[PDB]
Amino acid sequence: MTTFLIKHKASGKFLHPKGGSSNPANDTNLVLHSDIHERMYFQFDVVDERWGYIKHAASGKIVHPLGGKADPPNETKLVLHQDRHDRALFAMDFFNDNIIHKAGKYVHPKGGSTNPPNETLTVMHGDKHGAMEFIFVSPKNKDKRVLVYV
């Protein structure tokens, strides 16, 4: 029941539903944006050990690779959708600072910039570098890491 911000480590921007709606439509893209508000709070619903759903707190929709592929290819866009099923399972790796999908690819800003412009889309991608790192922080203190698994 921890509520948290998903902060892009290299830039300090955050994960947002595009347009910042408190009830985004199914398949709304997830983007990076520098602002902080209640419509970009997230929660994490643990389903199976490390695996769980990344839940948009304001709407209850969860993060999906678009099209619900179990093994999405590189550049598959990330979106919000009400559906709850095991092709939307991620782990929040707070030791290596990344978000990893069940099939092994990572959440990236599209293009992998260390300082992506606001509204950059997010995609799945297998590579690791400094610009796909994320930390999970308190909505009350964007520099304080919080535990997403409790």
Annotated binding site: 16, 19, 27, 35-37, 64, 67, 75, 83-85, 108, 111, 119, 127-129
- How far apart (Å, rounded) are the C-alpha atoms in residues 61 and 59? 5
Q: How far from the centroid of its chain's Cα atoms is residue 85's Cα?
A: 16
Please report, as a single letter, which amino acid is at residue 86.
Answer: D
- Domain borders along the chain are 1-150
Angle, alpha carbons 22-101-56 (nearest 5°): 10
Task: Tell me which residue of 68, 62, 45 sits closest to 150, measured CA to CA.
Answer: 45
Q: Which residues are annotated as a binding site for D-galactose?
A: 16, 19, 27, 35-37, 64, 67, 75, 83-85, 108, 111, 119, 127-129
**Strands 51-56 vs 42-48: parallel, antiparallel or unpaired:** antiparallel
- CB under 8 A, 24+ apart: contacts of 57-62: 57/3, 58/21, 58/22, 58/23, 59/17, 59/21, 59/22, 59/23, 59/24, 61/24, 61/26, 61/28, 62/88
Amino acid (1-letter code) at residue 8: H
For this experimental structure, what is the resolution in angstroms? 1.8
Do 139 and 4 contact (CB within 8 A), yes or no?
Answer: yes
Q: Which fold has domain 1-150?
A: Trefoil (Acidic Fibroblast Growth Factor, subunit A) (2.80.10)
**Eight-class DSSP state of 129:** -
Phi-psi category of residue 35: left, alpha or beta, with phi > 0 → left and psi -120 to 50 → alpha = beta
Contacts of 49 (CB under 8 A, 6+ apart): none
DSSP SS3 for 150:
coil
CA-wise closest residue to 16 among 59, 75, 45, 69? 59
DSSP label at 131?
Answer: G
